[PDB]
Amino acid sequence: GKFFVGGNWKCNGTKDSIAKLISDLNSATLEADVDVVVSPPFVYIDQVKSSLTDRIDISGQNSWVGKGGAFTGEISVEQLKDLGCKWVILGHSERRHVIGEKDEFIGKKAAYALSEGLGVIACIGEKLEEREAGKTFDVCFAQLKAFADAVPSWDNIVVAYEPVWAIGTGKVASPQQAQEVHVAVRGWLKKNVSEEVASKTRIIYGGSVNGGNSAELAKEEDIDGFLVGGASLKGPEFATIVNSVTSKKV
Amino acid sequence: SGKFFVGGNWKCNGTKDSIAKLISDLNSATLEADVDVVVSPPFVYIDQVKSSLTDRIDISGQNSWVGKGGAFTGEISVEQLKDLGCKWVILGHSERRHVIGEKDEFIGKKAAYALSEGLGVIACIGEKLEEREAGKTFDVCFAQLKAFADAVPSWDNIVVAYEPVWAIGTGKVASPQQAQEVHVAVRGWLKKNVSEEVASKTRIIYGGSVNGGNSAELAKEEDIDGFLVGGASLKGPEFATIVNSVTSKKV
């Protein structure tokens, strides 16, 4: 499967800061064999689609579980597509653990998004209390099962592993610990979906990724790319992380 | 003693093309002068609406995050709503309370934050059918109000919207009389728990089923100060007529 780098801007940016970010992304020279995706806040998706190079795809940060209608404050898959999105991020750790979105709810969001023709960036990952109880793979496999029990197909799914236990806990995750989770996620796909899906599905790393560690991470056999957080807000650094694909080739 | 207020909540509806037509119909309408008019597009269309809609109508977000932006994937901050030109945000809407599950203190915090950052707040309250039938209409509504009151820095830029959630789809229907009974109690609650000044200046608007066939009638009730319109706000000419239903309140 082809190297994938997405930037999750989260709840950050204004018209002006995003205009500068877009200008920097457009000026960057990006390597050829990489799928590149950015994920603006809902309100800026129009601005980004109007001015960002079409070499980069656009993702929503969330989407409603089904068709639109009486869901005040929510955005539908139809509306994301209408605005030009090709992806949606679903089950991001902040939506699981800050908002409180549950697994089956997330699984349903994905099935709907995939059946309506969006790609899905499907996020999984365990918290500190969970890892400290030896439940890393139990947690991730239940999250995967909830996806697998619901989705019509894995063709347009990218799996993102987030080490929530490292994200802000003062703990840091090594490329070895990352590789360990990715290779297990791939094995779960082999045994619970199929061998074909396991090899063609991209498993991207969604821990702390920056210009100083992307080259090292890209070397791991089962890390197929990144879901970048804070660094995705800095155009040149994000471009360099995208271009870390060359490190996977060396 | 407050100016008539009519908001249109588009909820999770619309595309570029339908919203472009809605905006044209809204722009073509002649709206009565003594009314505050507000529309609330889905997040992704707020930019499109701000670019083309007459400045006579204010724009509202349908929700906002509880505090400053940052690591909250999928959420929109008050800073961003303001950046796009919104002057209002709807908070504690029944669909966010009962479908999404947002709790009172959380909603109260959202409103306090939005107001401190300079947005007006349409603060929604209302009881479910099970609650109404057990005699807890005012327990629920007053508790929802206390949660706002305990948090907000001021009531100057607050509009209270009462939603009869008990009628919203439950097969029951709400009359202007039943709405009036709730609104008069809410205003009384404000008199005793905030001040007489706030009670008389605060708009308390009706957020039940409002359409071109009942708005003139609803607008006649003494303590209904306007509307938070659902389905009808997607039909421009009908929304305009509802705004102009203010003439019914004078007659």
Author numbering:
A (entry chain A): 5 to 254
B (entry chain B): 4 to 254
Q: Which sentences did the original study use to describe this structure?
A:
Triosephosphate isomerase (TPI) interconverts glyceraldehyde 3-phosphate (G3P) and dihydroxyacetone phosphate (DHAP). One or various cytoplasmic and chloroplast TPIs (cTPI and pdTPI), are present in plant genomes. cTPIs are involved in glycolysis, whereas chloroplast enzymes participate in the Calvin-Benson cycle. The three-dimensional structures of AtTPIs confirm that both enzymes assembled as dimers with asymmetric units containing two monomers that fold into a canonical (β-α)8 or TIM-barrel. In conclusion, our data indicate that the duplicated TPI gene from A. thaliana has suffered two evolutionary fates: the cTPI isoform is susceptible to redox agents, whereas the pdTPI isoform is resistant.
Crystal structures of cTPI and pdTPI were solved at 1.7 and 2.15 Å respectively. The recombinant construct that encodes pdTPI eliminates the first 59 amino acids that correspond to the predicted chloroplast targeting sequence. In pdTPI, residue C15 presents an ASA of 2.8 and 3.3 Å2, whereas residue C89 presents an ASA of 8.2 and 8.5 Å2. In the case of pdTPI, DTNB conjugation indicates that this protein contains 1.6 cysteines per monomer, this number can be associated with local structural fluctuations or breathing motions near buried thiol groups. Previously it has been shown that residue K84 in yeast TPI exhibits breathing motions, since this residue is located at an analogous structural position near pdTPI-C89 it is possible that structural transitions may transiently expose the thiol group of C89 to the solvent. On the other hand, pdTPI was not inhibited by addition of DA but addition of DTT lead to a decrease in the activity of this enzyme. In contrast the addition of GSSG did not induce a significant effect on pdTPI activity in a range of concentrations from 0.87 to 4.3 mM. In the case of pdTPI mutants, a Western blot signal was not detected for the pdTPI-C15S mutant, whereas the intensity of the signal for pdTPI-C89S was similar to that of the wild-type pdTPI. From these loop 3 residues, the only interaction that is different between AtTPIs, is that in cTPI residue M83 makes a hydrophobic interaction with cTPI-C13, whereas in pdTPI residue Q83 makes a H-bond with pdTPI-C15. Our structural data suggest that the H-bond interaction of pdTPI-C15 to pdTPI-Q8 is responsible for decreased reactivity in pdTPI-C15.
